[PDB]
Design an enzyme around this catalytic site. Structure first.
Site, PDB file in Angstrom:
ATOM      1  N   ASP A 142      20.979 -23.138   1.726  1.00  0.00           N
ATOM      2  CA  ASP A 142      21.076 -23.798   3.013  1.00  0.00           C
ATOM      3  C   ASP A 142      21.816 -25.079   2.784  1.00  0.00           C
ATOM      4  OD1 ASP A 142      20.707 -24.999   5.500  1.00  0.00           O
ATOM      5  OD2 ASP A 142      18.552 -24.639   5.618  1.00  0.00           O
ATOM      6  N   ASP A 153      24.982 -26.626  10.208  1.00  0.00           N
ATOM      7  CA  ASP A 153      23.717 -26.309   9.542  1.00  0.00           C
ATOM      8  C   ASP A 153      23.670 -24.798   9.557  1.00  0.00           C
ATOM      9  OD1 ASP A 153      21.119 -26.250   8.515  1.00  0.00           O
ATOM     10  OD2 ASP A 153      20.205 -27.285  10.243  1.00  0.00           O
ATOM     11  N   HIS A 222      16.594 -25.935  16.038  1.00  0.00           N
ATOM     12  CA  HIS A 222      16.628 -27.274  16.617  1.00  0.00           C
ATOM     13  C   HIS A 222      17.954 -27.641  17.185  1.00  0.00           C
ATOM     14  CE1 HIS A 222      18.654 -28.455  12.903  1.00  0.00           C
ATOM     15  NE2 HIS A 222      17.835 -27.557  12.344  1.00  0.00           N
ATOM     16  N   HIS A 230      18.329 -33.115  13.456  1.00  0.00           N
ATOM     17  CA  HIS A 230      17.350 -32.687  14.448  1.00  0.00           C
ATOM     18  C   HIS A 230      17.380 -33.717  15.561  1.00  0.00           C
ATOM     19  CE1 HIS A 230      13.951 -31.158  16.476  1.00  0.00           C
ATOM     20  NE2 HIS A 230      13.323 -30.578  15.446  1.00  0.00           N
ATOM     21  N   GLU A 252      17.746 -20.815  13.519  1.00  0.00           N
ATOM     22  CA  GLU A 252      17.275 -20.354  12.221  1.00  0.00           C
ATOM     23  C   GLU A 252      15.959 -19.691  12.342  1.00  0.00           C
ATOM     24  OE1 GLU A 252      16.510 -25.001  11.121  1.00  0.00           O
ATOM     25  OE2 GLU A 252      16.430 -23.605   9.416  1.00  0.00           O
ATOM     26  N   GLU A 347      20.595 -18.676   9.158  1.00  0.00           N
ATOM     27  CA  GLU A 347      20.795 -19.763  10.126  1.00  0.00           C
ATOM     28  C   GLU A 347      22.243 -19.909  10.506  1.00  0.00           C
ATOM     29  OE1 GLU A 347      19.408 -24.473  10.399  1.00  0.00           O
ATOM     30  OE2 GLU A 347      19.914 -23.624   8.423  1.00  0.00           O
TER      31      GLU A 347
HETATM   32  N1  LIG Z   1      16.136 -29.565  11.084  1.00  0.00           N
HETATM   33  C1  LIG Z   1      16.569 -29.119   9.908  1.00  0.00           C
HETATM   34  O1  LIG Z   1      16.956 -27.952   9.746  1.00  0.00           O
HETATM   35  C2  LIG Z   1      16.588 -30.068   8.831  1.00  0.00           C
HETATM   36  N2  LIG Z   1      17.437 -29.951   7.770  1.00  0.00           N
HETATM   37  C3  LIG Z   1      17.245 -30.984   6.905  1.00  0.00           C
HETATM   38  C4  LIG Z   1      17.893 -31.297   5.677  1.00  0.00           C
HETATM   39  C5  LIG Z   1      17.451 -32.375   4.951  1.00  0.00           C
HETATM   40  C6  LIG Z   1      16.443 -33.202   5.452  1.00  0.00           C
HETATM   41 CL1  LIG Z   1      16.016 -34.631   4.553  1.00  0.00          CL
HETATM   42  C7  LIG Z   1      15.818 -32.947   6.662  1.00  0.00           C
HETATM   43  C8  LIG Z   1      16.213 -31.804   7.419  1.00  0.00           C
HETATM   44  C9  LIG Z   1      15.801 -31.204   8.643  1.00  0.00           C
HETATM   45  C10 LIG Z   1      14.741 -31.756   9.551  1.00  0.00           C
HETATM   46  C11 LIG Z   1      13.534 -31.039   9.760  1.00  0.00           C
HETATM   47  C12 LIG Z   1      12.552 -31.562  10.618  1.00  0.00           C
HETATM   48  C13 LIG Z   1      12.757 -32.787  11.263  1.00  0.00           C
HETATM   49  C14 LIG Z   1      13.934 -33.507  11.054  1.00  0.00           C
HETATM   50  C15 LIG Z   1      14.940 -32.988  10.215  1.00  0.00           C
HETATM   51 MN   LIG Z   2      18.276 -26.348  10.414  1.00  0.00          MN
HETATM   52 MN   LIG Z   3      19.590 -25.452   7.441  1.00  0.00          MN
END
Ligand SMILES: NC(=O)c1[nH]c2ccc(Cl)cc2c1-c1ccccc1
Ligand SMILES: [Mn+2]
Ligand SMILES: [Mn+2]
Length: 366
Positions: A142, A153, A222, A230, A252, A347
């Site tokens: 990912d 993403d 998200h 996010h 995803e 995703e």
């Molecule tokens: N939303 C995501 O897919 C996601 N991907 C990330 C990669 C690195 C980090 Cl440090 C955080 C994320 C987050 C995410 C997860 C829940 C709350 C806010 C962001």
């Molecule tokens: Mn994501």
């Molecule tokens: Mn991702």
């Protein structure tokens, strides 16, 4: 100018006029009332609102083309025997070159996730991690790219043992379902209900044991904002808020042979500045220096400890813990289901354009 093998030519060099390939273009799904949303494709007003944001969609496309070429390269060499560090560094070196990394204007949106087996997300190796990819591992690759904070993403699951083939098919089908059902004015919970129904229709057999594929209920899709992975809206992957025109989504899904719930496990590697925290004055010298390194290099984008090491930073763990304790930075520890369970993920990033739905990160692979 054509692409080399291994890829080394930046995406902006392959498209000099700065017009990048579109992703998969989809007509919006018909509403719950039965009426088609197809009119948007031909609406002159919607066509005008779409061209007004052409530069934006174009930045996503450049980042998505870098993503397709980086993941095609990874698939050709990813093998058991390699350490997780080797895999992440080889992928990120290619990603930096193809996106033409330029401070906060072009770069890596977030760390390379390579979560294994029962661990579904947010694992990347820290320095000294000796973990080696195994023949029986189920690895979630990912990784993210961005152009001017327009984030791609996008993720897939790597396996070498065919025993996981039907688990991969289940999750791929569920992600594709989530993508098909997403659209302007569609309720977020309806996308989630559709994902869950497809996911749970699959039963898999792994090493003489059988399981009904469970969607991971505390993991979700998200909305994405500029420099914000996010943006605030959650796409459940299980059964009030609607998707809106111009929004960007990460669709995803995660399927599991475990409980279908993740818990914080292992040591933390992923961190990200809380987007809603303003300027905080810091006097503690090591803590002040680390926050300045974060602000200059990552901003509100996610980072990992290896990325601090490569910048020549050392003895920053207490400084990083202080930033986490002050709520300036949030840690994102690996998210794992029960020991011995298996998790898979697919995703894509989708653009809810006024005229159509664009699966901008779609490839001929997934
Ligand atoms: N939303 C995501 O897919 C996601 N991907 C990330 C990669 C690195 C980090 Cl440090 C955080 C994320 C987050 C995410 C997860 C829940 C709350 C806010 C962001
Ligand atoms: Mn994501
Ligand atoms: Mn991702």
């Amino acid at each position: 100018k054509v692409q080399t093998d291994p890829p080394s030519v930046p995406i902006c060099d392959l498209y000099p006029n700065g017009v990048f390939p579109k992703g998969q273009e989809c007509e919006y799904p018909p509403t719950q009332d039965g009426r088609t949303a197809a009119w948007r494709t031909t609406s002159e007003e919607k066509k005008a609102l779409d061209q007004a944001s052409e530069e934006i969609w174009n930045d996503f496309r450049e980042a998505a083309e870098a993503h397709r070429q980086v993941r095609k390269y990874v698939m050709s060499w990813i093998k058991p025997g390699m350490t997780m560090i080797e895999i992440c560094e080889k992928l990120e070196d290619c990603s930096r070159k193809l996106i033409k990394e330029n401070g906060l204007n072009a770069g890596l949106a977030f760390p390379t996730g390579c979560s294994l087996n029962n661990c579904a997300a947010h694992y990347t190796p820290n320095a000294g991690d000796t973990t080696v990819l195994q023949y029986d591992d189920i690895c979630k690759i990912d990784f993210g790219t961005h152009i001017s904070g327009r984030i791609i993403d996008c993720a897939f699951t790597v396996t070498f043992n065919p025993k996981y083939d039907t688990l991969l098919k289940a999750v791929k089908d569920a992600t594709n379902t989530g993508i098909k059902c997403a659209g302007i004015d569609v309720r977020l919970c309806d996308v989630g209900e559709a994902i869950q129904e497809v996911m749970e229709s699959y039963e898999v057999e792994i090493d003489g044991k059988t399981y009904q594929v469970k969607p991971i209920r505390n993991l979700n899709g998200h909305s994405i904002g500029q420099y914000r992975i996010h943006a605030g809206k959650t796409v459940p992957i299980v059964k009030a808020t609607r998707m809106e025109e111009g929004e960007v989504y990460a669709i995803e899904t995660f399927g599991s042979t475990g409980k279908g719930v993740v818990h914080d496990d292992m040591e933390c590697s992923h961190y990200m500045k809380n987007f809603d925290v303003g300027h905080v004055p810091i006097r503690l010298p090591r803590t002040k220096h680390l926050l300045n390194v974060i602000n200059e290099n990552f901003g509100t984008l996610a980072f990992c400890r290896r990325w601090l090491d490569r910048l020549g930073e050392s003895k920053y763990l207490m400084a990083l813990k202080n930033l986490c304790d002050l709520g300036i930075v949030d840690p994102y520890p690996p998210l794992c289901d029960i020991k011995g369970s298996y998790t898979a993920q697919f995703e894509h990033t989708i653009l809810l354009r006024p005229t159509c739905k664009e699966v901008v990160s779609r490839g001929d692979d997934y």
